[PDB]
Design a binder for this molecule. Structure first.
Ligand SMILES: CC(C)(O)c1ccc(N2CCN(c3nnc(Cc4ccccc4)c4ccccc34)CC2)nc1
Ligand SMILES: [Zn+2]
Length: 457
């Protein structure tokens, strides 16, 4: 035994000395976790890191294999999301290279990497931090771009905005990465096997992880609610029109096979009810436009004509003319196709837009979990530090000289981080990438790869 007791190791570097304990620094194998926990977390990260790596690479290769058709917004946003999670996996898997984990996570003296960039130490820690943090943050800024684009693409039935998507997603995590290095708040950890911001000083996790993720949840959340509201607004008004069109089509059949004015008058009144009900509906072309807009007046005008022609046939039928009323119903079919059919087509929401919403909501859930776990660690780090400090000073309170009848040391870390919370965080973090990679899990991509192999061989 020597000058230092577990979890401190002997060091000649004063920048590594732990508070009042001169000549001792914190052992590189994170003292807050057991060896069994370390080996369990490394297997977890290796599994999740490799699967994210393979699934995102497949989605990247599938996009570039059909790059002529695939490079189209808002679908190509999923390509860039998958690129962030691919680059991210490399940073997480680097620790599995013979001896790289200890090279990334330890100082030259065998203590924990803290407050990096540190003078005279290698750059292995900052590079791994840059890859993991930049990829993690670019991936979530792309999530806000996914929610915004899905919200704004309903206005069709993104030109120019595409460059502002790239400017925002690649320069924002850049500014955040340079800011962390300027304040030097990168810390190493042997259980995650990476270097990251605010592991030790929890205030920096709050400002560089919780605040940016927090803001993407309120902004991304707002555009998801506005988009899902617009979607059910278009879907309901479309189905209303289809139901009114079907009512007009069925009562037109009745007037065609009628042999009395009472059968004609009854079907015309049911047609008049449908026309005035369909007039109340908001056309999909003006789903976000004024109720007195030029497009809105046009839609209503068509039904005013259609009502007039129903009433003109009703005047003849109400008095006694049967033949003169039935012939007018044939003319209603032309007015129907010229003034209504145009609006029953402008509300057909395509499959891309349908699953782009599913992916946005699914991505939101995983980012919300990530936020909650990062919040848990932020909130409880102050108590995990006083527990550790008390444990260190308990262990360092060693008997000096010949043995007196002193009781056996009784030291333990009271409260320590939750490995389960870290496993939930990493599950939702790597789970976003694996879930977003299933964007190309369609029958159409099976054909893209069939076509590619045939051209190669
Ligand atoms: C210096 C000392 C002993 O006081 C100290 C201080 C803090 C500390 N950490 C280690 C890393 N801890 C973790 N934080 N976040 C996460 C989740 C995460 C990391 C990076 C990117 C995204 C999520 C962890 C995942 C696995 C294992 C540990 C994780 C927090 C507590 N460990 C030791
Ligand atoms: Zn339809």
């Amino acid at each position: 035994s020597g000058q230092c007791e577990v979890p401190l190791v002997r060091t000649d570097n004063p920048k590594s000395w732990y508070e009042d304990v001169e000549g001792c620094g914190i052992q590189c194998q994170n003292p807050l976790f057991t060896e069994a926990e370390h080996q369990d977390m490394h297997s977890y990260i290796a599994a999740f890191g490799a699967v994210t790596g393979l699934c995102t690479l497949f989605t990247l290769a599938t996009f570039v294999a059909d790059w002529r058709n695939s490079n189209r917004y808002p679908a190509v946003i999923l390509f860039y999301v998958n690129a962030c999670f691919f680059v991210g996996s490399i940073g997480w898997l680097a620790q599995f290279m013979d001896g790289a984990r200890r090279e990334i996570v330890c100082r030259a003296d065998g203590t924990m990497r803290l407050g990096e960039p540190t003078s005279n130490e290698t750059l292995s820690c900052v590079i791994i931090f840059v890859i993991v943090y930049y990829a993690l943050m670019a991936g979530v800024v792309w999530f806000v771009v996914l929610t915004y684009a899905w919200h704004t693409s309903f206005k069709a039935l993104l030109s120019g905005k595409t460059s502002y998507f790239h400017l925002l997603t690649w320069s924002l995590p850049f500014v955040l990465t340079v800011a962390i290095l300027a304040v030097a708040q990168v810390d190493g950890d042997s259980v995650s096997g990476i270097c990251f911001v605010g592991y030790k000083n929890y205030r920096y996790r709050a400002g560089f992880v919780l605040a940016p993720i927090g803001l993407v949840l309120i902004v991304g959340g707002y555009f998801l609610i506005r988009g899902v509201m617009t979607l059910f607004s278009i879907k309901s008004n479309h189905a209303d029109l289809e139901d009114n069109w079907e009512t007009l089509n069925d009562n037109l059949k009745v007037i065609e096979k009628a042999d009395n004015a009472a059968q004609v008058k009854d079907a015309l009144t049911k047609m008049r009810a449908a026309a005035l009900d369909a007039q109340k509906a908001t056309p999909p072309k003006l789903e976000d436009k004024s109720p007195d807009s030029p497009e809105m007046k046009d839609f209503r005008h068509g039904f005013d004509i259609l009502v007039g022609q129903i009433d003109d046939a009703l005047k003849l039928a109400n008095e006694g003319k049967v033949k003169e009323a039935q012939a007018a119903a044939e003319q209603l079919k032309t007015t129907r196709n010229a003034y209504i059919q145009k609006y029953l087509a402008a509300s057909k929401i395509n499959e891309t837009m349908l699953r782009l919403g599913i992916f946005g909501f699914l991505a939101f859930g995983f980012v919300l979990i990530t936020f909650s776990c990062h919040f848990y660690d932020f909130f409880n780090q102050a108590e995990w530090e006083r527990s550790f400090r008390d444990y260190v000073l308990c262990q360092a309170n060693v008997t000096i000289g010949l043995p007196t009848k002193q009781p056996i040391p009784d030291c333990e870390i009271k409260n320590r981080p939750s490995l389960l919370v870290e496993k939930i965080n990493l599950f939702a973090m790597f789970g976003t990438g694996i879930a977003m990679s299933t964007w190309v899990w369609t029958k159409a991509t099976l054909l893209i790869w069939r076509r590619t192999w045939c051209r190669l061989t």
